[PDB]
């Protein structure tokens, strides 16, 4: 049916964090970015309806934010909210972008933001060109916010936030379809030396 779009999560994997080695120069200095996860993408965060639509995606982070940190993703520098994972000593920062490669990375540093098209953040009438899917790219870096144990650190799967689907077709907009933005759990490997 015309509006039978269905949500699909976008996920990024703890297991891709490189081994974290902290030497005497950066030991006990907080906060500090300790590594980036492999960036991911999902073309079909919303997909399925038979009638094409002009769509946009609004992201809302849902973890507690405890501070800010300046960072430039390897995948200018910007401020990012540091979100508390619930694991002592570990925070995360988030960036997101449109699925299409030319769209810019959007730092997560506010209560909610349109990740694509970014024009919608200053124009409430701005949507993506009409098509059958809405997708995104996801970027995450881990932050040492405090002492971490040596060895393997278990990181449970966490929901980072959700994307709300909006459209200039009211019947689709009124569904308030939402898709989870997920950090798949894993183990970080951490070595700390003085
Ligand atoms: Co120490
Ligand atoms: Co080791």
TrEMBL record:
GO terms for biological process: cell adhesion involved in single-species biofilm formation. Keywords: Fimbrium, Signal. It comes from the Bacteria. The keyword Ribonucleoprotein does not apply. Its main location: other. The keyword Signal applies. It is found in: Fimbrium. GO terms for cellular component: pilus. Belongs to the fimbrial protein family. This is Fimbrial adhesin. It comes from Proteus mirabilis (strain HI4320). The chain holds residues 21 to 211 of 360 of the full protein.
């Amino acid at each position: 049916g015309a509006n039978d779009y269905v949500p699909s999560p976008i996920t990024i994997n703890t297991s891709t964090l490189p081994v974290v080695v902290i030497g005497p120069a950066d030991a006990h200095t907080y906060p500090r970015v300790i590594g980036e996860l492999t960036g991911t993408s999902n073309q079909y965060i919303f997909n399925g309806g038979s009638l094409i639509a002009l769509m946009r995606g609004k992201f809302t982070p849902t973890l507690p934010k405890i501070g800010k940190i300046t960072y430039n993703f390897r995948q200018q520098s910007s401020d990012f909210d540091i979100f508390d994972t619930g694991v002592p000593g570990l925070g995360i920062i988030i960036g997101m972008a449109g699925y299409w490669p030319a769209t810019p990375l959007v730092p997560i540093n506010s209560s909610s933001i349109y990740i694509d098209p970014v024009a919608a953040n200053t124009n409430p009438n701005a949507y993506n060109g009409a098509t059958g899917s809405f997708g995104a790219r996801l970027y995450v870096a881990f932050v040492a916010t405090g002492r971490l144990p040596n060895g393997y650190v278990t990181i449970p799967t966490k929901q980072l936030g959700h994307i709300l689907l909006e459209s200039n077709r009211a019947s689709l907009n009124n569904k308030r379809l939402t898709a989870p933005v997920m950090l798949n759990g894993g183990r970080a490997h951490h070595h700390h030396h003085h």
